[PDB]
Design an enzyme around this catalytic site. Structure first.
Site, PDB file in Angstrom:
ATOM      1  CG  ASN A  53      47.606   9.532  44.460  1.00  0.00           C
ATOM      2  OD1 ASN A  53      48.196   9.226  45.480  1.00  0.00           O
ATOM      3  ND2 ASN A  53      48.246   9.911  43.372  1.00  0.00           N
TER       4      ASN A  53
ATOM      5  CG  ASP B  19      43.852  12.288  41.991  1.00  0.00           C
ATOM      6  OD1 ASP B  19      44.366  11.180  42.243  1.00  0.00           O
ATOM      7  OD2 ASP B  19      44.438  13.202  41.381  1.00  0.00           O
TER       8      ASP B  19
ATOM      9  CB  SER C 260      46.625  10.387  39.931  1.00  0.00           C
ATOM     10  OG  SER C 260      46.765  10.689  41.303  1.00  0.00           O
TER      11      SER C 260
ATOM     12  CG  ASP D 226      51.777   9.178  44.317  1.00  0.00           C
ATOM     13  OD1 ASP D 226      51.451   9.959  43.412  1.00  0.00           O
ATOM     14  OD2 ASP D 226      51.680   9.468  45.529  1.00  0.00           O
TER      15      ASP D 226
ATOM     16  CG  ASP E  29      55.582  22.699  39.103  1.00  0.00           C
ATOM     17  OD1 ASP E  29      55.584  23.069  37.912  1.00  0.00           O
ATOM     18  OD2 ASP E  29      54.548  22.450  39.742  1.00  0.00           O
TER      19      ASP E  29
END
Ligand SMILES: [Cl-]
Ligand SMILES: [Cl-]
Ligand SMILES: [Cl-]
Ligand SMILES: [Cl-]
Ligand SMILES: [Cl-]
Ligand SMILES: [Cl-]
EC number: 3.2.1.17
Length: 129
Positions: free
Chosen positions: A46, A48, A50, A52, A101
Protein backbone atom coordinates in the site's frame (compact mmCIF):
# COMPACT_ATOMS: atom_id res chain seq x y z
CA UNK A 1 -2.14 -22.18 -4.05
CA UNK A 2 -4.40 -20.79 -6.85
CA UNK A 3 -7.97 -21.93 -5.95
CA UNK A 4 -10.72 -22.61 -8.48
CA UNK A 5 -13.94 -20.59 -7.95
CA UNK A 6 -15.95 -23.63 -6.65
CA UNK A 7 -13.00 -25.00 -4.60
CA UNK A 8 -12.74 -21.59 -2.79
CA UNK A 9 -16.59 -21.35 -2.41
CA UNK A 10 -16.53 -24.81 -0.77
CA UNK A 11 -13.58 -23.86 1.55
CA UNK A 12 -15.24 -20.56 2.64
CA UNK A 13 -18.63 -22.29 3.33
CA UNK A 14 -16.96 -25.06 5.46
CA UNK A 15 -15.11 -22.27 7.46
CA UNK A 16 -18.48 -20.53 8.09
CA UNK A 17 -18.28 -17.42 5.79
CA UNK A 18 -21.69 -18.07 4.02
CA UNK A 19 -24.08 -15.45 5.53
CA UNK A 20 -21.43 -14.39 8.15
CA UNK A 21 -22.71 -10.93 9.41
CA UNK A 22 -25.37 -11.35 6.66
CA UNK A 23 -22.88 -11.52 3.71
CA UNK A 24 -23.88 -14.37 1.34
CA UNK A 25 -21.09 -16.63 0.01
CA UNK A 26 -21.02 -14.90 -3.44
CA UNK A 27 -19.88 -11.64 -1.73
CA UNK A 28 -16.79 -13.39 -0.29
CA UNK A 29 -15.92 -15.20 -3.60
CA UNK A 30 -16.34 -11.88 -5.56
CA UNK A 31 -14.08 -10.09 -2.98
CA UNK A 32 -11.39 -12.89 -3.28
CA UNK A 33 -11.52 -12.78 -7.12
CA UNK A 34 -10.83 -9.01 -7.27
CA UNK A 35 -8.41 -8.85 -4.24
CA UNK A 36 -6.18 -11.87 -5.06
CA UNK A 37 -7.46 -13.63 -8.26
CA UNK A 38 -7.92 -16.64 -5.83
CA UNK A 39 -4.12 -16.71 -5.15
CA UNK A 40 -3.27 -17.46 -1.46
CA UNK A 41 0.35 -16.12 -2.07
CA UNK A 42 -0.84 -12.63 -3.35
CA UNK A 43 0.96 -9.67 -1.62
CA UNK A 44 0.45 -5.98 -2.50
CA UNK A 45 2.27 -2.96 -0.94
CA UNK A 46 0.00 0.00 0.00
CA UNK A 47 0.98 3.72 -0.45
CA UNK A 48 1.06 4.12 3.41
CA UNK A 49 3.86 1.42 3.58
CA UNK A 50 1.51 -1.33 4.94
CA UNK A 51 1.12 -4.59 2.91
CA UNK A 52 -1.97 -6.69 2.04
CA UNK A 53 -1.56 -10.49 2.34
CA UNK A 54 -3.36 -13.52 0.97
CA UNK A 55 -6.67 -14.52 -0.67
CA UNK A 56 -8.50 -11.57 1.07
CA UNK A 57 -5.66 -8.98 1.03
CA UNK A 58 -5.63 -8.51 4.86
CA UNK A 59 -3.60 -5.36 5.78
CA UNK A 60 -0.55 -5.27 8.14
CA UNK A 61 -1.54 -1.78 9.52
CA UNK A 62 -4.32 -3.24 11.79
CA UNK A 63 -4.60 -7.07 11.49
CA UNK A 64 -1.26 -9.02 11.18
CA UNK A 65 2.48 -8.52 11.98
CA UNK A 66 5.03 -8.33 9.08
CA UNK A 67 7.63 -6.46 11.19
CA UNK A 68 7.93 -3.47 8.77
CA UNK A 69 4.67 -1.46 9.27
CA UNK A 70 5.39 1.36 11.82
CA UNK A 71 2.94 2.14 14.69
CA UNK A 72 0.81 -0.70 13.22
CA UNK A 73 -1.26 -3.21 15.25
CA UNK A 74 -1.69 -7.01 15.09
CA UNK A 75 -5.41 -7.31 16.06
CA UNK A 76 -5.73 -10.90 14.58
CA UNK A 77 -2.56 -11.89 16.58
CA UNK A 78 -0.74 -13.60 13.59
CA UNK A 79 2.35 -13.11 11.40
CA UNK A 80 1.25 -11.88 7.95
CA UNK A 81 3.07 -14.96 6.43
CA UNK A 82 0.31 -17.24 8.00
CA UNK A 83 -2.14 -15.45 5.60
CA UNK A 84 -0.26 -16.93 2.55
CA UNK A 85 -0.83 -20.66 3.46
CA UNK A 86 -2.63 -23.13 1.06
CA UNK A 87 -5.02 -23.53 4.07
CA UNK A 88 -7.37 -20.47 4.35
CA UNK A 89 -8.24 -20.87 8.11
CA UNK A 90 -6.11 -17.90 9.34
CA UNK A 91 -7.40 -15.71 6.48
CA UNK A 92 -11.04 -16.64 7.21
CA UNK A 93 -10.70 -16.09 11.06
CA UNK A 94 -9.13 -12.62 10.43
CA UNK A 95 -11.87 -11.70 7.77
CA UNK A 96 -14.58 -12.53 10.42
CA UNK A 97 -12.96 -9.98 12.83
CA UNK A 98 -12.54 -7.34 10.06
CA UNK A 99 -16.17 -7.56 8.85
CA UNK A 100 -17.45 -7.36 12.50
CA UNK A 101 -15.35 -4.15 12.99
CA UNK A 102 -18.26 -1.75 12.07
CA UNK A 103 -18.30 -0.99 8.27
CA UNK A 104 -18.93 -4.63 7.24
CA UNK A 105 -17.43 -5.56 3.82
CA UNK A 106 -16.82 -1.85 2.99
CA UNK A 107 -13.41 -2.55 4.68
CA UNK A 108 -12.49 -4.20 1.30
CA UNK A 109 -12.36 -1.26 -1.20
CA UNK A 110 -12.51 -3.76 -4.14
CA UNK A 111 -15.75 -5.28 -2.67
CA UNK A 112 -17.29 -1.74 -2.36
CA UNK A 113 -16.19 -0.71 -5.92
CA UNK A 114 -16.66 -4.03 -7.85
CA UNK A 115 -19.01 -6.42 -5.91
CA UNK A 116 -21.40 -4.28 -3.77
CA UNK A 117 -24.88 -4.05 -5.43
CA UNK A 118 -23.95 -6.57 -8.24
CA UNK A 119 -25.44 -10.08 -8.88
CA UNK A 120 -22.86 -11.86 -6.61
CA UNK A 121 -24.82 -15.21 -6.70
CA UNK A 122 -23.24 -15.57 -10.20
CA UNK A 123 -19.91 -16.18 -8.39
CA UNK A 124 -21.26 -19.47 -6.91
CA UNK A 125 -23.16 -20.54 -10.14
CA UNK A 126 -22.75 -24.28 -10.98
CA UNK A 127 -20.97 -25.00 -7.64
CA UNK A 128 -21.81 -28.29 -5.84
CA UNK A 129 -21.90 -26.83 -2.26
CL1 LIG B 1 -24.47 -15.45 -2.96
CL1 LIG C 1 -7.76 -5.68 5.33
CL1 LIG D 1 5.29 -3.81 12.16
CL1 LIG E 1 4.58 -12.15 14.48
CL1 LIG F 1 -8.61 -24.27 3.18
CL1 LIG G 1 -23.07 -4.89 7.41
Amino acid sequence: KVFGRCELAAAMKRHGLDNYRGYSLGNWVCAAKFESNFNTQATNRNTDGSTDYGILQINSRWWCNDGRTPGSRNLCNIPCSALLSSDITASVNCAKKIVSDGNGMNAWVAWRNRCKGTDVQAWIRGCRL
